Amino acid sequence: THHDYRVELVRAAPPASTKPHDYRQEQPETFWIQRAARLPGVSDIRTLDTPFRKNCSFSTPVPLSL
Amino acid sequence: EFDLSDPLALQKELPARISDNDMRNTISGMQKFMGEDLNFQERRRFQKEQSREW
Amino acid sequence: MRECISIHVGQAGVQIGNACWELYCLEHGIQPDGQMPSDKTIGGGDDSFNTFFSETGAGKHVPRAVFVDLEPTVIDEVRTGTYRQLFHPEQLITGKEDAANNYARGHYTIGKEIIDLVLDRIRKLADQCTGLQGFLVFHSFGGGTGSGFTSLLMERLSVDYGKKSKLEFSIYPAPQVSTAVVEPYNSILTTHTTLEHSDCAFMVDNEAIYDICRRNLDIERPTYTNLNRLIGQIVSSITASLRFDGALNVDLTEFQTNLVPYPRIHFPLATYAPVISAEKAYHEQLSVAEITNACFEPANQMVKCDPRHGKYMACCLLYRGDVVPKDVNAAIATIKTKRTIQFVDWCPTGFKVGINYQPPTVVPGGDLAKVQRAVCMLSNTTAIAEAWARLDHKFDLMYAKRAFVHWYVGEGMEEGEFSEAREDMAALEKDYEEVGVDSV
Amino acid sequence: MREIVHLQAGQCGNQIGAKFWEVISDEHGIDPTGTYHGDSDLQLERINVYYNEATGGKYVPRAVLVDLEPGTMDSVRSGPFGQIFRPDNFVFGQSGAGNNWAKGHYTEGAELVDSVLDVVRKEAESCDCLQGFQLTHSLGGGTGSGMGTLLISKIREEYPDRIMNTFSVVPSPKVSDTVVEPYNATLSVHQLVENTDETYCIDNEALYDICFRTLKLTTPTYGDLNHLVSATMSGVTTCLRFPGQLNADLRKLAVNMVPFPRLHFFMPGFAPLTSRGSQQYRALTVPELTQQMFDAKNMMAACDPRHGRYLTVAAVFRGRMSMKEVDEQMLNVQNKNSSYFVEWIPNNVKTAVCDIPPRGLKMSATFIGNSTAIQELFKRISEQFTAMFRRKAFLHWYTGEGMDEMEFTEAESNMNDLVSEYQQYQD
Amino acid sequence: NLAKKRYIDLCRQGRIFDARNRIIGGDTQAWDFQVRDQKIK
């Protein structure tokens, strides 16, 4: 089966990335991530590398604020 | 008021959305919607590239 | 102002609070020295840390945590590890001799010397929380301080605070593979404090987590880190609606409403769905409908109970990442078609969904692949009454020859607790059968 | 001169009304900041129905936003038009209800009701001749339905002659996302029937059945469900802001719809909705608009009026269009199909023509219909109340707030009157 | 006397109307010197 079914001379190797990818600190793209400012459930955007962190600066009471 | 009773008003007319880049399609004119997705396929493709590299 | 104070009791409690709390440093920006490095030129907008972390003037964040032990050797590794400037020096309580696999030592004799000091650091961490949701309890049913002293920790916390939420995450003993002999005397006798003095209760067994991590991941021979790491991915996803934005937001008060029908009845089951390896994340699409149905599987539950034996009372889903409301609502309807999952006669509606935005955080040196979706599901089931039945057997088996009983009745522990707190379980095992029976 | 004070409550009520104000402000040429930047003169003539005046020629709405959790005020303040609202109009409590009618009605929603009634009594007495109020809420949550009916009870004990109107999103039966919702909805319909003049029924199931079937959208969201509720929140009040060949305000449609004072649950629908590929294949004439008011798929409730009898019918037409062709097509629908119409009312149709269409459009059409096929909307709530209530299911969450089980038992039979009151007119 | 009091009240206004650094804070540069001296002793 090795001698008969062997296939060589193929276009080997995975396709080229065209961007630098690290799996440690890169988040997937989503319908939500590409349309992040125009979503009904998204708060204020004031962080880089992730738009979806809670930003409760408008809603905290004036007694309890920074 | 001849324009109400034209014989050719249906010919001499425009649809409300000739293409996706047309000027008279605002929020109150309910032809253009926010959740139609033309960026869907490119976003899905780059999602798959991101998954592969991770 | 969405605070929660964690309480970690025992070596099981401490070593879980080392892996929960290196998740919450990476989830936000905080390093092991306490500083948030992104605080400069971007400040005030990130109020997400305020649930768990507490700010000082220097830009240093201190957790809302209390670590309790009755032995010095577990916390002293925490006191000089990597995270030794993160914790306040007085939030780590240690005794001098441990309770030594014995309920009565940690309750009646040895736990009387730490309850006066621990109940004073709780007051200082709850007199700065302007709105406290509720405490969190991480303990082990089988040890001495995890079981003897927690039953005395909870009993004061009824008086001291009244009707705040006291959630608990416990390690119930495994039905087959245990690391003790006096294990069922402890685990029976602490049922009467997780019955009265708990508002919700989650009882995982470490044998079930061994099954998932060997099979769903690819760690043959895991250690207790890879078990602590999976427990941290549930406590974060429960509280991820308190810190990051969501299309639908559900709180600790809000699923308490939607999961417990009667106040004797609070024992759900935790199941976190995509736990797959990085090589087998290459080959599997991980859509919303494909992970919402792996929660229901009897091979992925983290208790050694099968929900095909009993009827679901309520369910609580917690979606996270790149989901959509159109597809969360689309795949719930599939579950309702199949008979193989059945709901109870008196719960026609059934569910409670929660949709967050910020996807879960991968940990460097961890094992789970970095994905874009998740589900955490907390279902209430009649088929949890078998897990106390495989331990009802092993209490009366050992107690009929009255073995090991001199180690308890010589500590100032009376004899009538053995015949009572087991016959306590002889009604909560009969309560769960009647609250599922089909109507007349 | 005929002012409308908007009230809106809950996450459902604050996310419907935020899109509705993006509909109105464009319709009157108002920027995101508030300033007027229009072209016509009719856009600035009856703007005082909905807008006040600030200094420097800047218009601020008469909207009072109500919530029990503080996290849906930040969503609205920092949205697209969140800077047009006066910040004192936002009302928020610092702890929610969490899907509970009792915390809405007695425990938590009674300490917040006395601070909104100091807001609305400041906005209702600042009108030269106040026409009425509005509400926008849902019968599934805690603050939409619990305190959202506490508010209506205080209004109609204080301003009884004025119009009270509601756009209720009653709970969807078969796409449902709360176990404890039939307790909330069954306990809330006695408070609707004694304290509302009109009330509209909206199901989110039947807003999805437009966006899949009619519009052929790929990925709709809640932004395209609020986009349709505001389409019929503006067509009811379009003869109050723009002149016509025949006018109808919010009262004249109420005079002509309810024959008996307990029968005010209706069924909206908006006609010229066209899918994107079928947009170029359609022309805008009059029978293209009455073929889609009266189409049974189009309706914004998930109940079918072919199962019942139309008590009365409305229609609001917008555009510059012919009074013969308006009138001849509504006789046309009455005559082909004359078993869907009650006998004892001979004409069952009220019609009104407004001149000024929605922006960028030539013609438009709106509907309000009263049915005996809407007693099939409450019996599917009664069957899932007494199936669940007879075993005392989630009852400890409600009785420990200070209630009684007889308070449930009356809300069994007060809503079961409306099942059998409506039933005797099908006979 | 008057010029000393006027400069003192202006610097007091400047050091108190920083709202965060009034209700919270400290002197890290002095505390490093104090812990260094205690180590030396």
PDB file of C-alpha atoms in Angstrom, chain C residues 35-153:
ATOM      1  CA  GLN C  35       0.239  47.479  38.189  1.00  0.00           C
ATOM      2  CA  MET C  36      -1.989  47.883  35.177  1.00  0.00           C
ATOM      3  CA  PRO C  37       0.448  48.966  32.455  1.00  0.00           C
ATOM      4  CA  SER C  38      -2.234  50.363  30.136  1.00  0.00           C
ATOM      5  CA  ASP C  39      -3.498  52.742  32.839  1.00  0.00           C
ATOM      6  CA  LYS C  40      -1.460  55.596  31.386  1.00  0.00           C
ATOM      7  CA  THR C  41      -3.332  57.791  28.822  1.00  0.00           C
ATOM      8  CA  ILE C  42      -6.255  55.311  28.913  1.00  0.00           C
ATOM      9  CA  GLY C  43      -7.929  55.498  32.309  1.00  0.00           C
ATOM     10  CA  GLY C  44     -11.450  55.628  33.653  1.00  0.00           C
ATOM     11  CA  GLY C  45     -12.908  53.923  30.591  1.00  0.00           C
ATOM     12  CA  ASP C  46     -11.921  50.480  31.845  1.00  0.00           C
ATOM     13  CA  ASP C  47     -14.065  50.067  34.932  1.00  0.00           C
ATOM     14  CA  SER C  48     -14.232  46.340  34.335  1.00  0.00           C
ATOM     15  CA  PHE C  49     -11.784  45.415  37.084  1.00  0.00           C
ATOM     16  CA  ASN C  50     -13.965  46.849  39.851  1.00  0.00           C
ATOM     17  CA  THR C  51     -15.853  43.608  40.455  1.00  0.00           C
ATOM     18  CA  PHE C  52     -12.734  41.749  41.561  1.00  0.00           C
ATOM     19  CA  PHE C  53      -9.953  44.313  41.984  1.00  0.00           C
ATOM     20  CA  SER C  54      -9.686  47.305  44.280  1.00  0.00           C
ATOM     21  CA  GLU C  55      -7.729  50.420  43.380  1.00  0.00           C
ATOM     22  CA  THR C  56      -5.196  52.316  45.468  1.00  0.00           C
ATOM     23  CA  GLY C  57      -3.681  55.708  44.773  1.00  0.00           C
ATOM     24  CA  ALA C  58      -0.436  54.322  43.353  1.00  0.00           C
ATOM     25  CA  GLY C  59      -2.164  52.546  40.479  1.00  0.00           C
ATOM     26  CA  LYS C  60      -1.968  49.235  42.323  1.00  0.00           C
ATOM     27  CA  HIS C  61      -4.887  46.791  42.308  1.00  0.00           C
ATOM     28  CA  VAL C  62      -5.558  44.481  45.259  1.00  0.00           C
ATOM     29  CA  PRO C  63      -8.137  41.660  44.946  1.00  0.00           C
ATOM     30  CA  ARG C  64     -11.256  41.122  47.013  1.00  0.00           C
ATOM     31  CA  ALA C  65     -10.130  37.764  48.297  1.00  0.00           C
ATOM     32  CA  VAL C  66      -9.574  35.924  51.543  1.00  0.00           C
ATOM     33  CA  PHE C  67      -7.459  32.762  51.543  1.00  0.00           C
ATOM     34  CA  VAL C  68      -8.037  30.519  54.555  1.00  0.00           C
ATOM     35  CA  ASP C  69      -6.060  27.506  55.709  1.00  0.00           C
ATOM     36  CA  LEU C  70      -5.426  25.654  58.966  1.00  0.00           C
ATOM     37  CA  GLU C  71      -1.986  24.449  57.772  1.00  0.00           C
ATOM     38  CA  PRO C  72       0.937  26.772  56.952  1.00  0.00           C
ATOM     39  CA  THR C  73       2.548  24.855  54.050  1.00  0.00           C
ATOM     40  CA  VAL C  74      -0.017  25.654  51.345  1.00  0.00           C
ATOM     41  CA  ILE C  75      -0.258  29.429  51.638  1.00  0.00           C
ATOM     42  CA  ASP C  76       3.494  29.870  52.164  1.00  0.00           C
ATOM     43  CA  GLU C  77       4.052  28.879  48.541  1.00  0.00           C
ATOM     44  CA  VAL C  78       1.589  31.625  47.551  1.00  0.00           C
ATOM     45  CA  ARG C  79       3.348  34.096  49.856  1.00  0.00           C
ATOM     46  CA  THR C  80       6.648  33.746  47.986  1.00  0.00           C
ATOM     47  CA  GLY C  81       5.664  32.705  44.451  1.00  0.00           C
ATOM     48  CA  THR C  82       5.274  34.921  41.404  1.00  0.00           C
ATOM     49  CA  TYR C  83       2.152  36.698  42.676  1.00  0.00           C
ATOM     50  CA  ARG C  84       3.570  37.650  46.048  1.00  0.00           C
ATOM     51  CA  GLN C  85       3.059  41.396  45.679  1.00  0.00           C
ATOM     52  CA  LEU C  86      -0.461  40.986  44.321  1.00  0.00           C
ATOM     53  CA  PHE C  87      -2.061  39.888  47.573  1.00  0.00           C
ATOM     54  CA  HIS C  88      -2.343  42.005  50.688  1.00  0.00           C
ATOM     55  CA  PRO C  89      -0.360  40.282  53.484  1.00  0.00           C
ATOM     56  CA  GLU C  90      -3.355  40.066  55.820  1.00  0.00           C
ATOM     57  CA  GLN C  91      -5.710  38.419  53.358  1.00  0.00           C
ATOM     58  CA  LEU C  92      -3.929  35.053  53.693  1.00  0.00           C
ATOM     59  CA  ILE C  93      -4.960  33.380  56.964  1.00  0.00           C
ATOM     60  CA  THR C  94      -3.088  30.355  58.357  1.00  0.00           C
ATOM     61  CA  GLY C  95      -3.212  28.410  61.604  1.00  0.00           C
ATOM     62  CA  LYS C  96      -0.607  26.171  63.171  1.00  0.00           C
ATOM     63  CA  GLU C  97      -2.095  22.653  63.094  1.00  0.00           C
ATOM     64  CA  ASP C  98      -4.636  21.507  60.537  1.00  0.00           C
ATOM     65  CA  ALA C  99      -7.997  19.863  61.189  1.00  0.00           C
ATOM     66  CA  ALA C 100      -6.576  16.535  59.998  1.00  0.00           C
ATOM     67  CA  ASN C 101      -9.441  14.884  58.017  1.00  0.00           C
ATOM     68  CA  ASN C 102     -11.888  15.316  60.826  1.00  0.00           C
ATOM     69  CA  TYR C 103     -15.098  17.338  60.884  1.00  0.00           C
ATOM     70  CA  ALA C 104     -15.168  18.035  64.609  1.00  0.00           C
ATOM     71  CA  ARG C 105     -11.642  19.414  64.854  1.00  0.00           C
ATOM     72  CA  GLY C 106     -12.232  22.045  62.202  1.00  0.00           C
ATOM     73  CA  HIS C 107     -15.679  22.823  63.568  1.00  0.00           C
ATOM     74  CA  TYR C 108     -15.655  22.503  67.344  1.00  0.00           C
ATOM     75  CA  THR C 109     -12.030  22.719  68.531  1.00  0.00           C
ATOM     76  CA  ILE C 110      -9.491  24.002  66.002  1.00  0.00           C
ATOM     77  CA  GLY C 111     -11.740  26.216  63.916  1.00  0.00           C
ATOM     78  CA  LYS C 112     -12.720  28.298  66.957  1.00  0.00           C
ATOM     79  CA  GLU C 113      -9.387  30.137  66.879  1.00  0.00           C
ATOM     80  CA  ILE C 114      -9.560  31.391  63.277  1.00  0.00           C
ATOM     81  CA  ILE C 115     -13.229  32.385  63.068  1.00  0.00           C
ATOM     82  CA  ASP C 116     -12.586  35.483  65.145  1.00  0.00           C
ATOM     83  CA  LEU C 117      -9.879  36.731  62.742  1.00  0.00           C
ATOM     84  CA  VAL C 118     -11.347  35.678  59.405  1.00  0.00           C
ATOM     85  CA  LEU C 119     -14.718  37.291  60.210  1.00  0.00           C
ATOM     86  CA  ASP C 120     -12.852  40.587  60.651  1.00  0.00           C
ATOM     87  CA  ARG C 121     -11.215  40.628  57.236  1.00  0.00           C
ATOM     88  CA  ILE C 122     -14.624  39.914  55.718  1.00  0.00           C
ATOM     89  CA  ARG C 123     -15.959  43.082  57.326  1.00  0.00           C
ATOM     90  CA  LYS C 124     -13.102  45.162  55.943  1.00  0.00           C
ATOM     91  CA  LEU C 125     -13.635  43.809  52.414  1.00  0.00           C
ATOM     92  CA  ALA C 126     -17.378  44.378  52.594  1.00  0.00           C
ATOM     93  CA  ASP C 127     -17.242  47.869  54.065  1.00  0.00           C
ATOM     94  CA  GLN C 128     -15.663  49.169  50.867  1.00  0.00           C
ATOM     95  CA  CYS C 129     -18.021  47.403  48.466  1.00  0.00           C
ATOM     96  CA  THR C 130     -20.794  49.915  47.864  1.00  0.00           C
ATOM     97  CA  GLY C 131     -23.034  47.415  46.156  1.00  0.00           C
ATOM     98  CA  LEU C 132     -22.134  43.809  46.860  1.00  0.00           C
ATOM     99  CA  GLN C 133     -23.757  41.121  44.755  1.00  0.00           C
ATOM    100  CA  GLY C 134     -22.708  38.170  46.889  1.00  0.00           C
ATOM    101  CA  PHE C 135     -19.845  36.102  48.172  1.00  0.00           C
ATOM    102  CA  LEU C 136     -18.261  33.147  46.412  1.00  0.00           C
ATOM    103  CA  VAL C 137     -17.261  29.986  48.276  1.00  0.00           C
ATOM    104  CA  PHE C 138     -14.565  27.578  47.095  1.00  0.00           C
ATOM    105  CA  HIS C 139     -14.110  24.607  49.411  1.00  0.00           C
ATOM    106  CA  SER C 140     -13.823  20.832  49.542  1.00  0.00           C
ATOM    107  CA  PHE C 141     -16.382  18.494  51.099  1.00  0.00           C
ATOM    108  CA  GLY C 142     -13.813  15.929  52.184  1.00  0.00           C
ATOM    109  CA  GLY C 143     -11.088  17.695  54.140  1.00  0.00           C
ATOM    110  CA  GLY C 144     -11.103  18.976  57.658  1.00  0.00           C
ATOM    111  CA  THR C 145     -10.895  22.728  57.245  1.00  0.00           C
ATOM    112  CA  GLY C 146     -12.747  22.553  53.938  1.00  0.00           C
ATOM    113  CA  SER C 147     -15.711  20.863  55.600  1.00  0.00           C
ATOM    114  CA  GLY C 148     -15.550  21.378  59.341  1.00  0.00           C
ATOM    115  CA  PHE C 149     -14.766  25.062  59.347  1.00  0.00           C
ATOM    116  CA  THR C 150     -16.770  26.043  56.275  1.00  0.00           C
ATOM    117  CA  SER C 151     -19.870  24.781  58.077  1.00  0.00           C
ATOM    118  CA  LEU C 152     -18.868  27.197  60.845  1.00  0.00           C
ATOM    119  CA  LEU C 153     -17.940  29.883  58.336  1.00  0.00           C
TER     120      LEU C 153
END
